Amino acid sequence: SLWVDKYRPKSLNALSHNEELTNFLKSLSDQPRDLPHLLLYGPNGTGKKTRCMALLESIFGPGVYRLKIDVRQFVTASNRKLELNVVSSPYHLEITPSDMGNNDRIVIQELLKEVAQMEQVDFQDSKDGLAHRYKCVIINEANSLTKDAQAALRRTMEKYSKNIRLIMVCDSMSPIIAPIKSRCLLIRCPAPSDSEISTILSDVVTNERIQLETKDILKRIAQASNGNLRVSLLMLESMALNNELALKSSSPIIKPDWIIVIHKLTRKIVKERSVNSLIECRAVLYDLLAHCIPANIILKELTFSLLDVETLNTTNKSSIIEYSSVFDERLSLGNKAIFHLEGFIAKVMCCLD
Template sequence: MSLWADKYRPRSLSELTFHPRISKQLQVMASSGEFPHLLVYGPPGSGKKTRVLATLREIYGAGTERLRVDVKTFSLSSGRKLEFNVISSSFHLEITPSDMGNNDRIVIQDLLKEIGQTESLDFSKFENAVVSPNTREHASSRKKFKVVIINEAELLTRDAQAALRRTMEKYSANIRLILICNTTSNIIDPIKSRTLPIRIASPSTSACAEVLEMILRKEHHARKAFPDDSEHRNIIFKRISDASERNLRMSIMMMEAMYMNHDTVSINTPIIKPDWIDVVHELATSICKDRSVSRLQQARSTLYELLAHAIPAKLLLKKLTLTIWDFTGALDLKDKAELRKAVISASTIYDERLSLGSKDIFHLEGFITKVMVILERYVVIN
């Protein structure tokens, strides 16, 4: 029993429902046998990885689904040993160099070179020869290279990216890179120019609803809990996809959680959001409503709790800003626009500081205090 989000993950390009144009392009590319380095980017829950894996399956066949995790050991110049996990099949491997923090350059240098310098032997030739000697004969010629998927490419340090740029050209005969990231803003230009960028946007609300509907069709038990009326179902799906900000993975999780927690789901059933979203929302609202020193003190403990539990500071800042933005939008003030502009401007300043600095709490608190001052000043003046 796995989660629906994993259970109903499409395995082939043809199963993918939304962004048909991209799926088509990938299919063409896969069948041509040659493809360039790829830079796949887009918001979370839009199906980047799913698409990439489906493409690999298209090229290499089902062998790409037999995955294992290896622990590779690297030694630094200082003599310290570092462990690094690599997920691999016999056709591709998947790495997350940002796990290594500042040492990601070593992974890029050592691991990629090692793979790049070895020609991959093609077992499938024999395999295919046994199974079906004719059908896949020509396929063997296009499997000369291994594919390396680099996750969280936006978190690569400058050093690692610099190490990557030459490797990409030098060993292109043996490896193809697929970089997956949420935004390209941290990727240096030389890398962008060496890759084919593919942006995967979040699915539209209707595409989201379509997927959810498809899952319900397959889950017979769950189907019964949801209303029969397709109109009503669509309203629920829309609420879910709005709440998840069109993050498909989150949408499916939310639907499953709704089903798990309620015997019957109606259009009024509350949507179950991840706990941290509720906490951030509560924090932002309380800041807007109660602008006092004691509130600041409480905000500190909440922020500490969120940060300690591995919620990224930048995401916190973004969520806080958006909630405050919504809150100020509902205010009845005469120069509301000015006020909202001030909030956004403060947010951008502290966003930069989060990137440059190292103590997240300093900057988040600075932002919260600044917002309180902006709001309080407007309230006192009006």
């Protein structure tokens, strides 16, 4: 398997990147009967899902990693077979309602309500139990729920709290409505420091010999990962296999292709500011959108690449960030992203000229 999954902490004691967070998780798992609904939020790739699985392993014991995929089928108002994969475990369930689109309301209203209605009585056990009495449902990407699946959950996880518990993983919990955040215990997961990422990469290159020339090459990957442990571990494997398992100080850091294309677009915007350049930028944006890359991330990386240009004055950057905020708000409240993604670029070139 990939080094991101192979070297994954499978227990609460194997976590080694945040210790004030691991202690809070141990405090939560000490008495699992009264565990409230949890909402883990933080940057992407910090280890939020790994920590959720480690907490579930501390609560229900080993075996929560024995995952099987049970394909479900749903029908909306106008008869149409809509399919959702449900990765399930003998003690917990993982669902991604965002994968089915705007119709995640029917998934939340049927699957989650049917799970929350089954008491999970098992053999007797009608009094209580630390495990196997209540159930854990993991809702990955809680941010992409379309404000109606979040309304069907407010009473679902409140009335049926005795037989079900929810642990939802999310980043930047702004599009999560206030009633959902009120019913839940907010758990902040900070990103690992560069020293911690370097230590984890050192452990990886110790278990698998890649012949590290200098400890600085692991630090460069950590600084290029911007706090993303999964990305850092992916670039480690990339520069490992692309250099015959021998990392040198001159080894280039491999970055995603869409990031390079966004940087090229930024340089084109800085160099050429005209209508035809705007049309070429629209072609680049369409090509980027054809790869199912979300438009908010396109705008975010484009803005933070334009703010890194050394030939731009402070007045230009203060206008770029303002246009970025305005068009991000427009993109959030919109249907088609090309209009806003082109308007931001047009205003940027109209300001830089």
